[model samples]
Target: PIMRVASIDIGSYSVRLTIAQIKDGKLSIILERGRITSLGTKVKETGRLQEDRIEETIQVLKEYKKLIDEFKVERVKAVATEAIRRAKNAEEFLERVKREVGLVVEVITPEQEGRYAYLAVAYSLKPEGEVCVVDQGGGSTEYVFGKGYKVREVISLPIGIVNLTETFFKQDPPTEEEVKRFFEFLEKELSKVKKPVDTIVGLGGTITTLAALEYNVYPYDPQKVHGKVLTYGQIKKWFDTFKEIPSEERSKRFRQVEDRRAKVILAGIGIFLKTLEIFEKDCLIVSDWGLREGVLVSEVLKENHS
Candidate 1:
């Protein structure tokens, strides 16, 4: 028997949907779609989801709902992260989503968020021994420790791309001092991963986008980007290259980076660079499969047992 399932992951920067098929316990993706709505806009500064961002998220979800219905997707799971968790008016956003989009979106805890991404990475990459998985999102970041499919520990923090960008990089292209300050901040915030794992698999938009750029993946090919190795030196080069180019220059020069992401690339890349420095790793494997795929895998497994 086969099952069709969809998972919608609404993070601070983007709302993404994954449509997958499960056959004989094997999961395969049919489509992965996402739109950057900046849902976490000013949530860190104001401690609430902005009205316009809320409206933007609603529209994206509405479109996602249409795809779910049209694809005859069964067992749809919609989940949110840090932005919703910290927002004072999160309840209002949830209610509006349920009422207006006709979709009930669950606010997942940091642990659940990390666990899902770990599951996705472990299952897809099948790395040996202890694996450290980092999912850097817009409003939150998740670090998971696991072997194979079993996640031993999950650590999450409120420091993410959007919040970090707003806090650190005020200039179009941040000055060297700002970049230095950013590293100084991450030095304190990024604690050690529980176990020592030589194999580091990076998830979320930042790492994948880097991988795409590395391969010159025009039109953004996931299959080409997944399971690719990105060395620390390569990232350092890319990060340094990005520092000189302003967002507008990036917009015109790079088709791989979109408008919204172009503005925040420096913040996201800095996070990776610092983490890699702390990890003492020179290279990492990039996984295209992340939380949304994990959500689908969870649902598919549930039905298979039932």
Candidate 2:
């Protein structure tokens, strides 16, 4: 009997699903589906998950459940992060998901979240030496450091793109002062990461989308965006370019940037650029792999080892 696995990650901005087959202790992905449901955007300002967003995500989960059942996935791992943990009514939300969607989603801690991302980075990119993986999401940014497969440090900051965009992007493209404040705020938030590493692999919607933007690849082909390099000059140039264009225009200008990403794309790029500056590194290796893949990989490890 073949072991087929699936993982669902209900993140703050999006909900994603990954299905794969396990053979010879190796995982091969078959399908990936995601949607920007914008869940938990209120968690930062208000300690609650929006009703509409909750409903939207529930529908997405239900859809995922359909696929999971259709594929006959034996081992399924579903998780909620950042916003789900921070939300005041997370329990209520989880209860509804169980009752309605028939899925028990685990809410992993910051450390566990970072660990999964680290594992995904290690297995996918196979980076050596003291490696640091920056997984940026809508509700939080996790900085995970390790050598090979062993984790060394995990630090998660509450400075993600959605909140930052809502906080600073008051003007259309953010005025000069708004831009100044946004970058300066990062210096304080990102200072918590003190690890010194040569290999810095960036994970999440931000970096991957930026890589898509760099290659001018629309509709997101993983092959084109993954394993691409972004230099300080390139990042700075695009950041400057996005600073002047309004969200609506920005989306129209670049086919790679979707509607929701167009609005908060500046903040996402800022996080990566600021992270590079804080770490004294000038380049970032963009990876399309993230929590979706990591969750399934976590199960693969347990099955093989135990």
Candidate 3:
């Protein structure tokens, strides 16, 4: 049986949609789109979804709905993470989405987010050693450890690129003092993870965008970016380079990073470096598939069996 399905990831910094065809127990991505809305830019301080941001996200969803319908999707699963999970007015936003867009969005817990990411990696990469998966987003980071397809331990932290940049990278081009503090803060938060893993896999925009910029690939190719190895030295090199360039200039130069992402990339690199430091690893492989792919695959399989 073949089923066409769509999955949406309403993340803090961006919203993404993927349409796929599942046939004979295999998943093939047919179409994908994403927009940087920065829905969670300052939600932590306000505890609410900004009205304009909410409206902007809804518009994007409507656009995605049109694409989903064009694909003749038989099933759709949309999940909201980090920003929505922490917002006080999450219900209000969800209600509006249901009313205006006719889509029900699920706010998944950090644990569930991590698990979905693990599933995506397991099914996509199928690594054969003690593997650690790190998913960095706008509002939180999920660290999952396991071997093969089974996840043994998972934890989600509130630290993310958007919030971290809001908190620490306030200075234009960032001051040395600010950079020092950012590094210390990330290392301190990541110190709790003492687990030893043979390989580390990084998921989400932070790593993927960095890989794209590092390779100077424009229009972003998932095949070239996926399973790409990014070493600690590579991260440090970009971190140092971006630390001196202002966000505006960095965005222009990189061009691969979205304008919104350019603002938080330094913070993201800090998180990436600290994670590598904590695990004593020099490099990590990037995965293009994450929560959305996992949700789509799981749902399609479930329905196919039913």
Candidate 4:
């Protein structure tokens, strides 16, 4: 018999839902969807989930609930990250979500966040020997280092695209001085990450979007982007190209990145570039699967084996 389950990731910049069917201990995706809600916008500056963002998130969850019901999902696991964890009013927002949408959104610790991301990369990519996974989200970035199935180390940094964008790059097309300072800051923050791996796997919107732009994949195809290798020169090329183009023209020029994502994408690219440089890696293997799929896999395995 096949069991259906749904996993929801309420990220700072986007909310994603993935439904999967599990049978005989194998999992396959049924459907996946995402919406950019910018729930983490200004969170670092404000130290709370903005009221408007809270309302927007609830509405998105309500829509997600409709899809969960349509699929007749037996189990649903929803988790919130970054913004919610730092928000002073996270409890109030969570209470509202439960009351209005009948969904309990758990704020996962950074350790759990990194572990789940590792599970997704390890299972989906099936990398051999020692490997490192990087998930660059809107509010924070997670790094997981391990070999085979066991995750040896997991760390989450407080730096992310949204926060980084707000902190620097105030100009329409960031000035060279701003870009230089941005790199310096990222390099310093990433200095704390001493784990060295020959191969690096990237997950989350930043990497995926870059892959899409690299291939000019509009109406983005995960199958095509996933497991693809992107060279550092290629990534650096796009970063250089993007820095010269203003945000107003990004959506028209780089159709792969939607309007909302365009605002913070440059920062995302910076993170990728700096991480790759620090790790001395020339290329990154991209993975479309991450926390959402990882959580869904865990839910099905637990219930089936219980």
lDDT of 3 by residue, 159-183 (tens): 9677788888779778999998988
In candidate 4, position 51 carries an lDDT of 89
**Local error of candidate 2 at residue 122 (angstroms):** 0.9
lDDT of 2 at 65: 94
Residue-level lDDT of model 4, residues 141-257, one tens digit each, is 888899976888888887868778878888978999999999999889898885678679998887898898888777899988999989999999989999999998998888888
Candidate 4 worst ten-residue window by lDDT: 297-306
| Model 2 residue-pair collision total | 0
TM-score for each predicted model, relative to the true structure:
0.84, 0.87, 0.84, 0.85
Candidate with the greatest TM-score versus the true structure: 2
- Misplaced by over 4 Å in model 4 are 11-16, 33-70, 85-89, 92-103, 304-306
Worst 10 residues of 1 by lDDT: 189-198
Clashing pairs in 4: none
Least accurate 10 contiguous residues by lDDT in model 3:
297-306
Candidate 1, 1-306: lDDT as tens digits: 777899999888889999998887788889888999987789879988899988988999999899999998888999998557789999999999989989989998887988988878877889787788988874677888888888888888678687787788888798898888988999788745534786888988889989999888888888899999999999999999999999889967878888878888888888888888887878889999878888887887678684
Output the TM-score of candidate 3: 0.84
